[PDB]
Ligand binder design. Structure first.
Ligand SMILES: [Zn+2]
Ligand SMILES: [Zn+2]
Length: 74
């Protein structure tokens, strides 16, 4: 299956389902796996956002805004 090492981001053959980008500047990022506190890697951005829905992390930080990681209530 892995002919190469998927090291090339240019192809984006892996990012298609193994990674996502910043919803603000659209820079290739990578989920940590912790408390969902995802922050941009772009030094010209560094915006913190909810990786799950790719929305603002600020309302998600126990403020009032709830989100659905893998279990949707919808
Ligand atoms: Zn960004
Ligand atoms: Zn969210």
């Amino acid at each position: 299956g892995s002919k190469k090492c998927d090291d090339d981001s240019e192809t984006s053959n892996w990012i298609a389902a193994n990674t996502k980008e910043c919803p603000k500047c659209h820079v290739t990022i990578e989920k940590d796996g912790g408390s969902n506190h995802m922050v941009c890697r772009n030094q010209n951005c560094k915006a913190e956002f909810c990786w799950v829905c790719l929305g603002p992390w600020e309302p998600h930080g126990s403020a009032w805004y709830n989100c659905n990681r893998y279990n949707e209530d919808d």
